[PDB]
Design an enzyme around this catalytic site. Structure first.
Site, PDB file in Angstrom:
ATOM      1  N   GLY A 180      27.779  73.247  16.841  1.00 45.91           N
ATOM      2  CA  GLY A 180      28.618  73.002  15.686  1.00 45.91           C
ATOM      3  C   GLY A 180      28.693  71.524  15.366  1.00 45.91           C
ATOM      4  O   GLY A 180      28.493  70.684  16.248  1.00 45.91           O
ATOM      5  N   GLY A 190      27.532  75.705  19.291  1.00 44.34           N
ATOM      6  CA  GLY A 190      27.583  76.702  18.235  1.00 44.34           C
ATOM      7  C   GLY A 190      26.390  77.635  18.262  1.00 44.34           C
ATOM      8  O   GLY A 190      26.505  78.819  17.939  1.00 44.34           O
ATOM      9  N   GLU A 249      30.213  70.687  26.317  1.00 39.89           N
ATOM     10  CA  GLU A 249      31.491  70.345  25.703  1.00 39.89           C
ATOM     11  C   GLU A 249      32.371  69.487  26.600  1.00 39.89           C
ATOM     12  O   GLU A 249      33.174  68.701  26.087  1.00 39.89           O
ATOM     13  CB  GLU A 249      32.262  71.612  25.318  1.00 39.89           C
ATOM     14  CG  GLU A 249      31.601  72.440  24.226  1.00 39.89           C
ATOM     15  CD  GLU A 249      30.519  73.354  24.758  1.00 39.89           C
ATOM     16  OE1 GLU A 249      30.697  73.894  25.870  1.00 39.89           O
ATOM     17  OE2 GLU A 249      29.493  73.531  24.069  1.00 39.89           O
ATOM     18  N   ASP A 276      33.951  76.865  23.463  1.00 40.34           N
ATOM     19  CA  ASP A 276      34.379  77.554  22.258  1.00 40.34           C
ATOM     20  C   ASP A 276      33.391  78.671  21.913  1.00 40.34           C
ATOM     21  O   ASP A 276      32.583  79.084  22.753  1.00 40.34           O
ATOM     22  CB  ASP A 276      34.534  76.528  21.128  1.00 40.34           C
ATOM     23  CG  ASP A 276      33.221  75.872  20.752  1.00 40.34           C
ATOM     24  OD1 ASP A 276      32.530  75.363  21.659  1.00 40.34           O
ATOM     25  OD2 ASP A 276      32.882  75.863  19.549  1.00 40.34           O
TER      26      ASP A 276
END
Ligand SMILES: [K+]
Ligand SMILES: [K+]
Ligand SMILES: [K+]
Ligand SMILES: [K+]
Ligand SMILES: [K+]
Ligand SMILES: [K+]
Ligand SMILES: [K+]
Ligand SMILES: [Mg+2]
Ligand SMILES: [Mg+2]
Ligand SMILES: [Mg+2]
Ligand SMILES: [Mg+2]
Ligand SMILES: [Mg+2]
Ligand SMILES: [Mg+2]
Ligand SMILES: [Mg+2]
Ligand SMILES: [Mg+2]
Ligand SMILES: [Mg+2]
Ligand SMILES: [Mg+2]
Ligand SMILES: [Mg+2]
Ligand SMILES: [Mg+2]
Ligand SMILES: [Mg+2]
Ligand SMILES: [Mg+2]
Ligand SMILES: [Mg+2]
Ligand SMILES: [Mg+2]
Ligand SMILES: [Mg+2]
Ligand SMILES: [Mg+2]
Ligand SMILES: [Mg+2]
Ligand SMILES: [Mg+2]
Ligand SMILES: [Mg+2]
Ligand SMILES: [Mg+2]
Ligand SMILES: [Mg+2]
Ligand SMILES: [Mg+2]
Lengths: 237, 66, 123, 467, 49, 102, 53, 154, 64
Positions: free
Chosen positions: D67, D116, D139, D147
């Site tokens: 992302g 993502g 992350e 996520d």
RNA sequence: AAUAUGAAUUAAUGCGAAGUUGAAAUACAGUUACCGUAGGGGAACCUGCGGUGGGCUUAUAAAUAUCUUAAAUAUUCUUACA
RNA sequence: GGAUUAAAACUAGAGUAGCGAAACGGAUUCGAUACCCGUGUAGUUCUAGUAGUAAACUAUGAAUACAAUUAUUUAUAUAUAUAUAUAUAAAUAAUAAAUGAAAAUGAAAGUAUUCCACCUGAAGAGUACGUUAGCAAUAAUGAAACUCAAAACAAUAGACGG
RNA sequence: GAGCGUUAAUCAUAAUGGUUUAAAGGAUCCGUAGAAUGAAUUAUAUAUUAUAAUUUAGAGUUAAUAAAAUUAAUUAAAGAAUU
């Protein structure tokens, strides 16, 4: 021949028999074919690259990409007749696979004609098992032959030890001569050593040839005599 | 031989080499796996599988396959 | 034909039946006078003595008319009425005389299809 | 006028979605996510689309490098928190749509699939890997959390050393990159197909259609998709050796085995007090080094989510990720460093790790607040055409390599059968390679079963016992 | 389009007719004792006796 | 053989098929239209279950070749709405059928 | 679809194009002229063997 | 050019019969609009600009220097052993052009033979040109446009 | 002859399709050399073992 | 001068039956037929000149062939060996 | 509209070996105004003209876009480890598809577009009449009536063939 | 059916045609009219057309380089044989 329809649609024709009731019982293949559909496009497919040499197929060099003069000293300012002909056929023609090694192979056997006389087995064992380190010419699993030289030459040019293919080829050739000379001596000496310890052999290669020539020369003697007697009588006429 | 080409097979051809067409084995493998699954399905379903081959030497393979 | 050739006249021929009684002048029937009664031989493979008559129509056309029915009282100078319709086996006889009209009487003792032979209904 | 960020195309009855941001490694922004989310709802209503194929136009360079969080960092620095919450509502809502999508989705992970990108594939039962696949969840180095529902997927799909989410915690907390075949063997990829064979596979996927009176949403058609992909799978490289050895798998299974109220310190203790082989001891020090260069707050949040989204349903796990992301961009309690770390690494190129300041140990209440919805900020996931929730993926198990818990179940069942027979390793391999219809002939299935029996089972006489 | 909704009202517009449900409703207000029965728009023609 | 039928009463659209010397022009018809076609085609339509059809035969009117041409036309010259929709990736709506739907 | 179908040559592009085309025509004329002179030179070398008197 | 369009319609039919997946057509505005309508209607799998030798992989600006070598490359579709694009014929011909008002276009889409044009069939695409723009006949009727009925694709 | 009879009889067929062979005449073509006994026996063997596994899976489900 | 009518007078042609004089054509039709043109003859037809195939594509051999471990080894082999 | 247009034919002047309508003879035959033989005129040749006709045929008007293969030549170009190899066109042969009443066509007799010529049952008839052109033979243009339910093509199986 | 039949007429009943071999490609080419047909981009207009500008893929001009010695007309020669 026309693209057939009835071989790939057996499932659909069969389903019409079952739905109407013309066929009472579902065939055993029916469920299997339904889960694994046949391919039914039968199309011609374009190709944009030669897999052997990576040459791009279907690319046109525009005049904007040729700003400098040519070998004749003239600039290119307009497309030529070849550039203006549609080339769709090249997308569909199976590309001619080429290899640099093919050129060296032809050279090696032109320089060493008698290497052809060494029998080669074309039947493969398992291409996937070949674990070869071409830092050296000899390899466990394959014979020493012309291919050993070619692969050694490619390794030298691939490792950039040599720049010119000719220089790498000559370097590999000498390695091949050294290995060939050590084998020619191991065989001569092995024969000599065996005879010195009482080894006996029925027929030598030279003797084998003499016997075969005698068999042919005996049939030839009969025919010559026969045909030198029909001539004498026929000529008497 | 490329002289005997049936152009309807164009999509299976990988290229030509030494005067013959080279079949694309990547497609052969995918087609082979699909065909193999069909044989397994029919066998597991109890269907009759017939192996037909009339070229010399094929009998031994054909008999053991059956 | 091209589009311009059609514009210039090219097209499918028209289908419309052609007149087979040109001497009547597009009339249902015409009066006439028998010039000579005759007997003619059918074309093969038919055999018979077909009664016909040469007739001069009121318009000056002379025609050959077939006399239908068994027996007739037509003579020379008899007033006859001629209608269309050819005698297939007699070539050149393209017309019929009407029985029961003019001086040609109806077929004697005709029982069936009387209206076609000028025969009145028996009491 | 500009090239659309995501390109949509028709492939017979298959609809191809292609990520078209090559310069950004196909990074996912709000625009991309919104476009894909809306177009997938239409394809769900369509009766002419049988399956969807999510690929990239940059292969083999990358499928999706993650992302677009660098843009979210600038938003935080500019207090554009509404923009940031829109970016996460779109992405997480798209990850929820893919997870619950009723038609087969086939992701081609031909390249870097990190962040993502993992959310685009982890939620599909047909996630195909290649030699160029590079799966990672980096992350912890940016100050964020795992996520895109990775805290609900990884603890449920990993195959080895994942009885208590030990391997899932290892990948999420260390950010280790897995490559190609290793991703397939770990369960990160359902299938392993050579990149060269992707063109042919795509064409075959477009040509297959549900038979007779079956819709594309039926389990029967899902089986057909699985078989179609299998025809394009090829045997693994001869030289290939699994990335993690049994000894390395023993360190992860022990050093990352926490309780329902565990803490990152407990893992640090195990990694610092581990005993065993020299390789295992050395391996534990490597993990300790890595885990000490991460964000002290991110590691605690990640552990919290894994221990919370490993027993909850999909919708509540994805919703809890939206809350956490929003509660991190807006740092009300100055407990995280997501924004500052993101600028240190992405907006500004700095190889060195960001010097961390929030090096405390957040309490259970502090973690609860960071992972719970604030009554002032109302955020909800966009509605999808399925609107369903469940605690277990409906298809992932059937079409991936079996987990260590499924092999154990068969050994226990077989060992407790009235037959009174002995469970033998050979019988275990046969039962998983030549029995289950959906796993028949599955690549690298016998190798995985032998890794499990050699490390988890005890061979006594002609039988096997589950140590 | 593959996902475009098309319903009775859209079809009615294509065929340039009132919706079929409207036709049914207008046919139920025809009875002399039925609701909706109305006839007054024609009382606009001058007549002299 | 099975022949596609639109609403199990007629053909899908119009057909212009050439079978040897026979030119077949078949048109689909409204419900209750009946069979208004060559007598040979009428019998085939009756057996097949076609109720509404219009058509004209040009050039050769050989009964044998009309019958075979008709069977071939019903199979090789027709495409169902479902087959057209799937091939083009589009939705095809029968306006008349939607007008009388809920 | 939005891209223009054709982009007209800029005045500068037309100037460079004209330079190359004039050069191409001039070079061919010069090369033919020099070839003719080289043939006239090789004919002078042998004109001593030709008879005009 | 309607002649060029007739050439393209015949070319696509020939390619469908042999089932070639990719072919090229002349590079012109009318050809591009024609191909784009077929692409949006699901008759063509792909539509790419290119040269005489093949589709361009990267954008190549078209100028007078290369206009003579430009081509449009279209991908044909085949499903269930049948070509999706079986027939492609002109309605308005070079030697007889047909211009219809919107009222007559509605009759053509309603089953009425107008000026010998057979009515629109199920699953058929009829294209109309109005002010040098090509659109489906149903779209021209929606915009109340009068235009030339160019071709019908099935 | 056999292939056409299979079509007429609605019998699915598998065949090795060489470069001079018509692919559409069979339900499931296998592109490959049909002139070498090694290539033929290699492809036949794979198909035969696949059948064997199906047979073994059918006999196994009957036992249990 | 035109139009119409009759007209001495005179030309071409069809069908019908029905014999006669030859045997021109269809097979290599017993002289290959026909096309154009010219001459000649009871009649078909005959002859000259060029053209056409709707006649010869109907087309089918001066023959000659070779060496490596015949087996304690290939031939056997049933998911085994590796 | 214009130009060119085999053979025969014609006008004028040269030429005339051989061949050869006709004619006159010899044979053959029941007859032989024929086939075969002899003598052989026009013609066949050249120059200057007239005429514009042939199975003047691929019995297939011209142009453009396009579509699956092989083989064989030819041409241009490219390369080299120099004599082949690789390209791109053309021609021809055999074909796929397609087309077709079929025989077959095959880059058209396929898929399309544009323009021209031409056809609308047989026979009467390419005749009659008129007109135009020509030294002439003739050439072009070109009907109707009467009569008939025929007439024609491809292919099939036979019969027959000096 | 108080009409029925018959004759004379009109409409309909296949060009959603053909021309190697069945009716039908002009002996051939050149070229005038054509109220026949015919490239590309852009901008206007009153719009499948018109106009303007621009473009080179059809069609042409010139030259360079290589190749070929045929087809017309004319003039000058040769050859075997025949009488
Ligand atoms: K004769
Ligand atoms: K003649
Ligand atoms: K003659
Ligand atoms: K003479
Ligand atoms: K000829
Ligand atoms: K012409
Ligand atoms: K014909
Ligand atoms: Mg009677
Ligand atoms: Mg073969
Ligand atoms: Mg005679
Ligand atoms: Mg005779
Ligand atoms: Mg004769
Ligand atoms: Mg004579
Ligand atoms: Mg002659
Ligand atoms: Mg004959
Ligand atoms: Mg013949
Ligand atoms: Mg004279
Ligand atoms: Mg004589
Ligand atoms: Mg003249
Ligand atoms: Mg004449
Ligand atoms: Mg003539
Ligand atoms: Mg000639
Ligand atoms: Mg010309
Ligand atoms: Mg005349
Ligand atoms: Mg015949
Ligand atoms: Mg009445
Ligand atoms: Mg009509
Ligand atoms: Mg024609
Ligand atoms: Mg001609
Ligand atoms: Mg003619
Ligand atoms: Mg040019």
């Amino acid at each position: 021949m026309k693209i057939q329809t009835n071989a790939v649609n057996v499932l659909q024709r069969t389903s019409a028999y079952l739905k109407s009731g013309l066929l009472k019982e579902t065939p055993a293949w029916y469920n299997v074919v339904a889960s694994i559909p046949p391919s039914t496009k039968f199309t011609r497919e374009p190709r944009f690259k030669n897999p052997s040499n990576g040459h791009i197929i279907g690319k046109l060099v525009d005049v904007t990409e040729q700003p400098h003069a040519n070998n004749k000293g003239l600039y290119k300012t307009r497309p030529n007749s070849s550039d203006k002909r549609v080339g769709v056929k090249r997308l569909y023609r199976p590309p001619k696979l080429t290899y640099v090694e093919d050129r060296l192979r032809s050279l090696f056997y032109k320089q060493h004609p008698w290497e052809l006389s060494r029998p080669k087995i074309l039947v493969e064992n398992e291409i996937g098992d070949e674990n070869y380190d071409w830092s050296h010419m000899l390899q466990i699993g394959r014979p020493l032959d012309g291919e050993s030289v070619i692969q050694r030459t490619m390794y030298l040019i691939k490792t950039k030890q040599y720049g010119d293919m000719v220089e790498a080829y000559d370097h590999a050739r000498y390695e091949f001569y050294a290995l060939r000379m050590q084998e020619e001596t191991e065989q001569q000496v092995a024969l000599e050593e065996a005879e010195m310890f009482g080894s006996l052999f029925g027929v030598s290669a030279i003797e084998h040839g003499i016997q075969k020539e005698q068999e042919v020369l005996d049939v030839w003697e009969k025919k010559v005599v026969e045909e030198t007697e029909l001539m004498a009588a026929r000529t008497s006429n | 031989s490329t002289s005997l080409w049936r152009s309807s097979t164009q999509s299976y051809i990988y290229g030509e080499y030494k005067g013959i067409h080279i079949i694309d084995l990547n497609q052969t493998l995918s087609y082979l796996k699909r065909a193999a699954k069909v044989v397994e399905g029919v066998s597991e379903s109890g269907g009759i599988i017939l192996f037909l081959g009339t070229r010399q030497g094929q009998k031994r393979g054909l008999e053991e396959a059956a | 034909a091209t589009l311009n050739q059609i514009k210039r006249g090219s097209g499918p021929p028209r289908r419309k039946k052609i007149s087979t009684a040109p001497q009547l002048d597009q009339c249902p029937q015409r009066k006439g006078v028998v010039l000579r009664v005759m007997v003619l031989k059918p074309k093969k493979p038919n055999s018979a003595q077909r009664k016909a008559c040469r007739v001069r129509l009121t318009n000056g056309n002379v025609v050959s008319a077939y006399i239908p029915g068994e027996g007739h009282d037509a003579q020379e100078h008899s007033i006859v009425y001629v209608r269309g319709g050819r005698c297939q086996d007699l070539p050149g006889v393209k017309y019929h005389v009407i029985r029961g009209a003019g001086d040609l009487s109806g077929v004697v003792n005709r029982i069936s299809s009387r209206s076609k032979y000028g025969a009145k209904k028996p009491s | 006028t500009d090239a659309p960020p995501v390109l949509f195309t028709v492939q017979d009855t298959a609809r191809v979605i292609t990520l078209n941001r090559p310069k950004k490694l196909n990074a996912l922004n709000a625009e991309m996510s919104e476009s894909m989310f809306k177009t997938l709802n239409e394809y769900a209503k369509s009766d002419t689309t049988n399956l969807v194929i999510l690929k990239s136009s940059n292969r083999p360079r990358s499928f999706c490098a993650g992302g677009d969080v660098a843009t979210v960092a600038i938003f935080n620095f500019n207090k554009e928190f509404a923009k940031s919450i829109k970016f996460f509502t779109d992405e997480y809502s798209l990850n929820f749509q893919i997870a619950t999508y009723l038609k087969p989705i086939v992701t081609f992970m031909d390249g870097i699939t990190m962040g993502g990108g993992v959310g685009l594939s982890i939620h599909t039962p047909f996630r195909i890997a290649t030699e160029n696949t590079k799966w990672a969840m980096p992350e912890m180095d940016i100050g964020f959390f795992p996520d895109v529902g990775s805290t609900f997927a990884l603890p449920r799909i990993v195959t080895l050393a994942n009885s208590n989410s030990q391997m899932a915690l290892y990948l999420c907390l260390t950010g280790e990159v897995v490559t190609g075949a290793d991703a397939y063997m770990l369960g990160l990829a359902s299938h392993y197909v050579s990149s060269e064979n992707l063109d042919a596979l795509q064409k075959r996927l477009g040509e297959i259609s549900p038979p007779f009176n079956n819709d594309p949403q039926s389990a029967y058609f899902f089986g057909m998709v699985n078989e179609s992909i299998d025809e394009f799978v090829s045997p693994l490289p001869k030289d290939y050796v699994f990335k993690y050895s049994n000894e390395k798998l023993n360190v992860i299974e022990a050093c990352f085995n926490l309780s329902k109220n565990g803490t990152i310190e407990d893992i640090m203790n195990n990694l610092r007090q581990y005993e065993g082989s020299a390789e295992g001891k050395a391996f534990a020090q490597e993990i300790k080094t890595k885990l000490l260069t991460k964000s002290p707050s991110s590691l605690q949040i990640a552990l919290r989510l894994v221990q919370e989204n490993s027993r909850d349903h999909i919708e509540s796990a994805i919703k809890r990720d939206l809350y956490t992301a929003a509660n991190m961009c807006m740092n009300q309690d100055s407990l995280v460093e997501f924004s500052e770390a993101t600028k240190h690494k992405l907006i500004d190129k700095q190889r060195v790790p960001y010097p961390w300041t929030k090096k405390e140990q957040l309490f259970v209440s502090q973690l609860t607040s960071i992972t719970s919805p604030k009554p002032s900020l109302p955020m909800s996931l966009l509605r999808n055409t399925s609107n369903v929730t469940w605690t277990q993926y409906p298809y992932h198990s059937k079409y991936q390599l079996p987990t260590e818990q499924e092999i154990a179940a068969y050994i226990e069942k077989r060992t407790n059968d009235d037959t009174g027979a002995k469970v033998t390793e050979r019988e275990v391999l046969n039962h998983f390679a030549n029995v289950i219809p959906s796993r028949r002939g599955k690549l690298g299935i016998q190798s995985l079963c032998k890794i499990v029996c050699e490390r988890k089972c005890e061979e006594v006489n002609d039988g096997l016992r589950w140590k | 389009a593959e996902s475009e909704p098309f319903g009775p009202v859209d079809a009615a517009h294509v065929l340039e007719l009132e919706p079929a449900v409207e036709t049914l409703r207008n046919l139920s207000t025809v009875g002399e004792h039925s609701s909706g029965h109305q006839q007054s728009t024609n009382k606009n023609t001058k007549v002299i006796y | 053989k099975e022949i596609p039928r639109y609403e199990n009463r007629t053909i899908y659209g119009d057909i212009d098929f050439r079978y040897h010397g026979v030119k077949l022009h078949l048109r689909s018809a409204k419900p209750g239209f009946g069979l208004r076609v060559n007598h040979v085609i009428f019998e085939i339509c009756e057996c097949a279950g076609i109720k509404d059809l219009s058509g004209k035969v040009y050039k050769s009117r050989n009964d044998m070749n009309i019958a075979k041409g008709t069977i071939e036309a019903f199979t090789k010259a027709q495409k169902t709405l479902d087959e057209v929709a799937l091939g083009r990736g589009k939705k095809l709506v029968d306006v008349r059928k939607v007008y009388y739907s809920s | 679809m939005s891209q223009p179908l054709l982009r007209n040559r800029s005045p500068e592009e037309s100037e460079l194009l004209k330079l190359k085309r004039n050069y191409n025509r001039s070079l061919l004329n010069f090369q033919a002229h020099k070839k003719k002179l080289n043939e006239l030179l090789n004919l002078y070398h042998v004109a001593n063997e030709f008879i005009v008197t | 050019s309607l002649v060029k369009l007739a050439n393209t319609c015949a070319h696509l039919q020939n390619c469908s019969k042999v089932r070639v997946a990719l072919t090229s057509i002349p590079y012109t505005k009318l050809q591009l609009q024609f191909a784009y309508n077929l692409y949006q209607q699901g008759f063509l799998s792909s539509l790419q600009k290119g040269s005489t030798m093949g589709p361009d992989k990267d954008f190549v600006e078209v100028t007078p220097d290369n206009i003579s070598t430009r081509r449009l490359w279209v991908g044909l579709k085949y499903r269930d052993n049948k070509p999706v694009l079986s027939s492609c014929k002109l309605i308005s011909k070079p030697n007889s052009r047909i211009h219809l008002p919107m009222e007559d276009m509605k009759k053509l889409c309603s089953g009425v033979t107008i000026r010998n044009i057979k009515p629109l069939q199920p699953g058929e695409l009829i294209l109309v040109r109005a002010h040098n723009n090509i659109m489906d006949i149903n779209e021209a009727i929606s915009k109340k446009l009068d235009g030339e009925v160019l071709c019908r694709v099935k | 002859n056999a292939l056409l009879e299979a079509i007429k009889s609605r019998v699915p067929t598998i065949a090795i399709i060489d470069t001079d062979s018509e692919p559409s005449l069979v339900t499931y073509p296998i592109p490959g050399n049909d002139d070498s006994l090694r290539s033929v026996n290699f492809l036949l063997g794979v198909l035969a073992r696949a059948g064997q596994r199906g047979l073994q899976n059918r006999l196994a489900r009957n036992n249990e």
